[PDB]
């Protein structure tokens, strides 16, 4: 997408020491969005094991 624009400067440039050539220059700024793809994946979680310890005073 388009964002903004800079100042437009008009210039005169000598050529072969005989003539002045008309020119101009500007900078136009755009927005963009870039997408890239990973090189792999991790393994899934198929099985989960959890250990539990319940501290109590009776034993």
């Amino acid at each position: 997408a388009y964002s903004s624009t800079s100042n437009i400067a008009r210039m005169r440039v000598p050529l072969n020491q005989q003539m002045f050539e008309n020119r101009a220059r500007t900078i136009v700024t755009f927005n963009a969005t870039f997408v890239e793809k990973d090189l792999g994946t991790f393994e899934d979680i198929e099985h989960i094991i959890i250990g539990i310890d319940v501290d109590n005073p009776s034993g």
């Binding site: 072969n16 005989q18 003539m19 002045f20 050539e21």
Partner: peptide, 8 residues
């Protein structure tokens, strides 16, 4: 003379 013109 510059190509494409008649000088100055």
């Amino acid at each position: 003379v510059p190509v494409g013109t008649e000088g100055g």
